[PDB]
Write a protein that binds this ligand. Structure first.
Ligand SMILES: *[C@@H]1O[C@H](CO)[C@@H](O)[C@H](O)[C@H]1NC(C)=O
Lengths: 221, 215, 197
């Protein structure tokens, strides 16, 4: 029974500052070296920094040395990570971790669930939903909605207000070069039921308060 | 600096199989290597620390080995709650901790032929300015699948970007969408738009194409 | 009662060249590592095989403080498994090294307006140095088929070469002072201990 709770993550512009905080519980916090470890979206894990059990020692990776700052308050049982001059490379989910200390060297005994830190110079934008219409294949067909140009994550996507569940795939978004995100959501249906059954996708972007219902119907010619 | 090469990049294995993953170091680490588990989305979790010491609360089926550069993690009998990406992590360089690339363990199952559909840019998108040609690879296995855009028989590269779902909970199949993004002016300058797909379950490459503005 | 003489190792008025790297033996003293902790003036500082935080509470049999001077581009060679002129011909660390390496820019100290040429390295050697080897032989390096009878000339080169340390050199060629703290624990009494007695 060991718990770590990250908080303080959020969207932030380049060159700004941001304060992260890990709340420890159910062990002697003031007697273990503490770790920060980040993981970029889709990339691998990356060690960030270390502070000693007494807070006298502070060590950093070469990618963040002289630019982050680790600290800790033993009375409050908290671990702080001040992030000054954030760059785009810092966009990642950050984790706090207990050392364990059973070795002369650092290892990672228990992991917190982490908090998201996105660095981007774009304002919040409403998504643009576009249809993806089929045609005469010849089997079964498929159709979808393109949730293009929005920021930040996430966007919730459903089909026929939740009535259409099986056969649906909503894909992870992709940070296109404009700093905005693009997302694809699709569903497969038998080639016959295209005139009778109506198809409408439901997109909701809470960070922008933009709800959109888009009709999807086959290409006409 | 120390880099860690973990191999294979991705493997397929069913339940009960004796799984083994190799982690190799750019230079000698005595035994300060660590094996971590990470489910998709969940936080990482310690499995093995210091070459071959089982962490408290980790099932006995897990076991490390090796010393020097070539280390090994072994699952004697795979279990369903173990399908996850496994990382290796060296510690010898204390103030420069580096991890491995990882080895996702996907549920082994029969080869599945993808259903390849292509979607032209909607008229609503064309009036805005941009144009996105979508190509869908649906329900297939394994992950490895080549998607190649052709525009007037011209091989395209760098114009698009893919996205793949995790191994689906129902049929254990993957899915992929290439989003070929380009401007309006670059859209009418060309006619044919094609999506060539190569996959292990295809006796020959499959192409799905359309001509601009003909339906 | 007696602290370990870490001050005369760092704050020494002058260091030696890399080929004649100077060794201080640390034994029979309480190790105060806080001189490493507070001094943020350190450009490069990496510990291998042992943690710096978990160091002030661990007894070792002997400590070995090596000190010398190199240039910035060469600093990354002071580590196990590395190769290069410094690692191969001047100062080689073993692959199972357990210690720490510290280095800081001393351009203000080891640079003269005319170029301080006092610091040297070994440019040629018939074989790579064994770990912790200190070669200072000035034997004329034989490079060609014609043997060198202690004379220089055609394929007879002097094995040592000088650094060109000027205040206007780029940070790559600026002089960095370097100290390697190696640690050894043997089947023997531990004479060096942190404050955790
Ligand atoms: C070496 O000098 C620095 C200041 O230049 C000082 O802070 C440090 O304490 C000195 N070393 C020792 C062991 O006192």
């Amino acid at each position: 029974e060991v718990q770590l709770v990250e908080s303080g993550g959020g969207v932030v512009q380049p060159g700004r500052s941001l304060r992260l905080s890990c709340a420890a519980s159910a062990f002697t916090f003031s007697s273990y070296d503490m770790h920060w470890v980040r993981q970029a979206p889709g990339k691998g894990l990356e060690w960030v920094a270390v502070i000693s059990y007494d807070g006298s020692n502070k060590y950093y990776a070469d990618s963040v040395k002289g630019r982050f700052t680790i600290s800790r308050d033993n009375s409050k049982n908290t671990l702080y990570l001040q992030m000054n001059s954030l760059r785009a490379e810092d966009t990642a989910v950050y984790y706090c971790a207990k050392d364990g200390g059973k070795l002369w060297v650092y290892y990672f005994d228990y992991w917190g669930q982490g908090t998201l830190v996105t660095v981007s110079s774009a304002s919040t934008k409403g998504p643009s939903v576009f249809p993806l219409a089929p045609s005469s294949k010849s089997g079964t067909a498929a159709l979808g909605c393109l949730v293009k140009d929005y920021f930040p994550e996430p966007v919730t996507v459903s089909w026929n207000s939740g009535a259409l569940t099986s056969g649906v795939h909503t894909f992870p978004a992709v940070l296109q070069s404009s700093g905005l995100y693009s997302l694809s959501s699709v569903v497969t249906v038998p080639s016959s039921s295209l005139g009778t059954q109506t198809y409408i996708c439901n997109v909701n972007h809470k960070p922008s308060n933009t709800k959109v219902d888009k009709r999807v119907e086959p290409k006409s010619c | 600096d120390i880099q860690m090469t973990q191999s294979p990049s991705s493997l397929s294995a069913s339940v009960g199989d004796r799984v083994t993953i190799t982690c190799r170091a750019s230079q000698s680490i005595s035994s300060y290597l660590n094996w971590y588990q990470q489910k998709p989305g969940k936080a990482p979790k310690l499995l093995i620390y210091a070459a071959s010491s089982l962490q408290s609360g980790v099932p006995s089926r897990f076991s490390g080995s090796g010393s020097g550069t070539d280390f090994t993690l072994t699952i004697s009998s795979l279990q369903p709650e173990d399908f996850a990406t496994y990382y290796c992590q060296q510690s010898y360089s204390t103030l420069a901790l580096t991890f491995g690339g990882g080895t996702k363990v996907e549920i082994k199952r029969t080869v599945a032929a993808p259903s390849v559909f292509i979607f032209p840019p909607s008229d609503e998108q064309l009036k805005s300015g941009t144009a996105s040609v979508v190509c869908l690879l649906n329900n297939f296995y394994p992950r490895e699948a080549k998607v190649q855009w052709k525009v007037d028989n011209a091989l395209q590269s760098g114009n698009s970007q893919e996205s793949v779902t995790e191994q689906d909970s129902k049929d254990s199949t993957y899915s992929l969408s290439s989003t070929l993004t380009l401007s309006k002016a670059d859209y009418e300058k060309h006619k044919v738009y094609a999506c060539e797909v190569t996959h292990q379950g295809l006796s020959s490459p499959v192409t799905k194409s359309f001509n601009r503005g003909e339906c | 009662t007696n602290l370990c003489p870490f001050g005369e190792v760092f704050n020494a008025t002058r260091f030696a060249s890399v080929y004649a790297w100077n060794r201080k033996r640390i034994s029979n003293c309480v190790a105060d590592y806080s001189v490493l902790y507070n001094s943020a003036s350190f450009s490069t500082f990496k510990c291998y095989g042992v943690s710096p935080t978990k160091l002030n509470d661990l007894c070792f049999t002997n400590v070995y403080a090596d000190s010398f001077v190199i240039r910035g581009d060469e600093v990354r060679q002071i580590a196990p498994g590395q190769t290069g002129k410094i690692a191969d011909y001047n100062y080689k660390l073993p692959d199972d090294f357990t210690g720490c390496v510290i280095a800081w820019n001393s351009n203000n100290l080891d640079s003269k307006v005319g170029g301080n040429y006092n610091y040297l390295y070994r440019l040629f050697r018939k074989s790579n140095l064994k770990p912790f080897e200190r070669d200072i032989s000035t034997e004329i390096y034989q490079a060609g088929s014609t043997p060198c009878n202690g004379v220089e000339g055609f394929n007879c080169y002097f094995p040592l070469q000088s650094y060109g340390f000027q205040p206007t050199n780029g940070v790559g060629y600026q002089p960095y002072r370097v100290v390697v703290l190696s640690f050894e624990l043997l089947h023997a009494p531990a004479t060096v201990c942190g404050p955790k007695k």
